[PDB]
Amino acid sequence: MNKSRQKELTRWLKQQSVISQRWLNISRLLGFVSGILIIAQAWFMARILQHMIMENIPREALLLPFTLLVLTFVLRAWVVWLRERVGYHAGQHIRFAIRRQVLDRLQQAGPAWIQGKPAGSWATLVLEQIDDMHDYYARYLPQMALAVSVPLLIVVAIFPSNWAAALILLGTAPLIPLFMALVGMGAADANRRNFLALARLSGHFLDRLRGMETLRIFGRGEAEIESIRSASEDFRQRTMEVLRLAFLSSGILEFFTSLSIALVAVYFGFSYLGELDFGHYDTGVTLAAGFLALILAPEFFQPLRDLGTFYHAKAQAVGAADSLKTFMETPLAHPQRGEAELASTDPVTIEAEELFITSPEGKTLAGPLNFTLPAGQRAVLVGRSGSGKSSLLNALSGFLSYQGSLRINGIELRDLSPESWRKHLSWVGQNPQLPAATLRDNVLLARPDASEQELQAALDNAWVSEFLPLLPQGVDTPVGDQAARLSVGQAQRVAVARALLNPCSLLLLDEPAASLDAHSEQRVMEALNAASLRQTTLMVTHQLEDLADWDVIWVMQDGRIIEQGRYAELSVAGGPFATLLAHRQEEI
Amino acid sequence: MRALLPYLALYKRHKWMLSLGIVLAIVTLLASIGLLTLSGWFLSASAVAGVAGLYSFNYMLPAAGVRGAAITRTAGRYFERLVSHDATFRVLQHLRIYTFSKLLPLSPAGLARRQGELLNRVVADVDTLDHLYLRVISPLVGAFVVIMVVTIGLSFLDFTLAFTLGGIMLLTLFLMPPLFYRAGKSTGQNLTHLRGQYRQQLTAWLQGQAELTIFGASDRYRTQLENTEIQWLEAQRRQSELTALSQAIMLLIGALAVILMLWMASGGVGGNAQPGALIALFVFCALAAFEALAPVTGAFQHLGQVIASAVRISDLTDQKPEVTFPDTQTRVADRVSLTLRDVKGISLQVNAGEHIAILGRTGCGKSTLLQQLTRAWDPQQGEILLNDSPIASLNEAALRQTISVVPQRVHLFSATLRDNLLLASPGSSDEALSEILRRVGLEKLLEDAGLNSWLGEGGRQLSGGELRRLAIARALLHDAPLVLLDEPTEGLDATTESQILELLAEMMREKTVLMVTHRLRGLSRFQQIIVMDNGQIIEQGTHAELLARQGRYYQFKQGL
């Protein structure tokens, strides 16, 4: 149909709605009941009002029509209550399925993709933006079904009593879509871009707030207030130009509901006076037919006027569907999942032949890698920042897909089943994260069914028990969000304790002592130097002076291993390592 | 709701656009009520008149009111929307300026206490305060004024009938919104608790995905996370279970008014035993008058959010800044000689035009020396003098001009390359701007869309080596006699580090440079090296002097 982004996103929003079609159909059925109970309510009010005004009947005689009018009002409130609890269910069961799809996809992509954006950027996509679509499904979609049931059902009711009053309402029925096709649909997509500019203006304010420290030292306080003023005024002027067209739809709908109420009153008003003798079916025009048409004339346009009240329900779901549609459609290259399984639990031998490491988007991270790590031999990766050192450790963990040959004990890493390969793996990792609740669960993450003796043995071997008394509750201290209770030096030792709790075939250590205290560096490397001799170890570091005892060194630059050898020969060779060692020794 | 007073007073800037928008909202509602009430009376009045009263009915006067009520409703709705949206964007503009103008005089200190996620609440709280007018004030004030105008104007017919329609409408404006805000307070508290627990568990599941999948715990933490969603989705249901009740009751109340008008006005309107046409006047007024009350119950719920956002913003902006700048007049000196006395009480003298290096080890001692040298906070220890005068005597406009800082954290604004450098110098020639980029070795940024490439969120993220060069470009553009280098060449490779140090010496030669570093590269060029631990200068002197005396600088060069 239409190639605009407004219609492409709105089509996506409706395709996600079949998860809860059952509820959107009950809400549609209850809209027909609302239309019937509106007509019955109007027919009783008109029938009561005619008796009092024309026939002069006391109110006490009209105890039956008053009773039926009250039930019709009571049933209307029941349907309204039912129709909105059904409406909530439709929205809830859609967001649950979309949130599950986002988490499934973002888990399949793995940490290689989750680290591409800040953690708060994913929570906006999962909490705020998925929830922004609730009102489209709970309110806007059910109301847009009500805007075609009730108006058509009102006309069928007033048609038998008076066809002229039915044409007044029906005559205005096709003009409203006609306005939309001509000029209304064009402004709808222009509005969608103003909501993007309003979200972009909110990032211009957040940027000036995040950089107040930089604006302060340059004396740009007053010149950024003017920058805020100009950006805000620029947005408002451009938005108000569009909103002059977009607010005609609200004005036209108010003109047609006012002209139709006026026409019903004028036609019926003069039909009683005898000036007009058309419209009725030769049975004469009564006051009951006039009130039925007049009571139902506002209700003919009420579903359409209420659909403009739910505009922002659609406008904020389209803004959310703008971000969820691209997320669910970005092409991701998941590392291949095999079916093989490692034979034994002895330390593994790693061989790489013309190995290339590829990011999920498709970019190459580490160039041609050729190395061999026999069983049980510790190895060191060194190099400059951004030289692809973590990519090698990510690839060995199974987080990045590789184009070359990377064999674990003579078995390709692609063919190894990740569920069983990662049981023979222990990674301390860079920027460690303690995702459990309490400090006892963070350590026991490797295996929750561990004896208290092994827990204490792991806590002692990792030098975590020495600062446990400083913690209030000891081993049961809750680390909290991002381990605010543990410092970066002592949260780094809990990661070591977690790594050493379970036996492993390959131990990967990525910058373990980087950005720790002078004391936590001693404690972490004391444990990791001793723990690296029990199995195959691959450590990434810049503490080049400490690493005089490791079996091999891989100086990695520009994604390639440019120098290999022991520390005794590389330090004095005068090549890439000597430059790195010379640069490192300047730091105090 | 006393928390809204500092922000209600912000409305004084646009009190004619804001009050016009409310007036147009009331006028539109009275045209809706007027048109249907007048239509209802016209039908009944002409029905009882019949054909016999055709000549003596005077139907021209009602028709002039039907024409006017349809135009007033048509145009009032169109300008209700325009005026109230224009005014909402003006309120937001003045809120953003007010918040920024109050958060800047307390920039380093006040917000110091996670400052990353604090600002996302500030941005979201200013947005929520922007909703107070259209989402809260306009519906509640509009409903009350509409009810009174109906109640007052409808009492020229029957006082008893007018008061029992307005009394019903006034009761449900003042009693029904508070009774539902109170009803859902328990669930609204349990809804905020479970939302932030899900966010905490989600973030810990995405951030720790490498740790969780390697240690085989990714599935059982997704389960705990998807159980907090189930509890959260149940608290969200019980919140709708109550909004579905506040909409059914609003339908029953407006049904009660119609029943009462049909019944009470049956007995009589005023002194009229048989009201006749006046029965339909009151019934059709009760049918249309309850459209003014539709937004009010949901306009009170959002008032709780606006109040909550108001205290959060007032807790920040209504802080006392740590430093107060005198409003005096000073001429910026071409040469600045910096001297310090007893600031854990370190004293140093920096003559004009000479470079200084400070060799504090990181972690063991953090150099807040550059922070109180830019008046982020006052030095409690002692006195800091700038060019033989106290630093506190300089007004902010001249303090900024006399000190140029290259902070360790370089901020890359979401703006063009030209806007990231006109920061330093407000007016610089487009060529003089481009010369500095070549000098600092940033000619690569000039290759593609030079001085027009979007930097930051929009695109073109700078690397660490290229981002340090940008901070130095800002310092070199913003010509100041005194330059404070905050750990430059940290986290950069050996090639870039040597490139910047030579850039520092060649470009900043007639400037008083005070460098804070924990490296040892290129300290021979710096005269009077200062070495300190935990804020205590062990010794000092030129590069040769330190080696001769065999102090702490000597063992540093020995690898010990």
Ligand code: HEB
């Ligand atoms: C430009 C884009 C846009 C924007 C941005 C906006 C922004 C806004 N807004 Fe708007 N709207 C619109 C577009 C818009 N808008 C429209 C179009 C309409 C119409 C709808 C109907 O029809 O009604 C409205 C309508 C409207 C209204 C009425 C309706 C209801 O009630 O619901 C209101 C109240 C509002 C508020 C508001 C606010 C507060 C804001 C801030 C954020 N809004």
Ligand SMILES: Nc1ncnc2c1ncn2[C@@H]1O[C@H](COP(=O)(O)OP(=O)(O)OP(=O)(O)O)[C@@H](O)[C@H]1O
């Ligand atoms: N997931 C990714 N997607 C895209 N590019 C990436 C990704 N991870 C790393 N890179 C980039 O690939 C190159 C190598 O990065 P990598 O993290 O492997 O280096 P590193 O030496 O381990 O880093 P550091 O010095 O910070 O420890 C850099 O340009 C880096 O920014």
Ligand SMILES: [Mg+2]
């Ligand atoms: Mg790395």
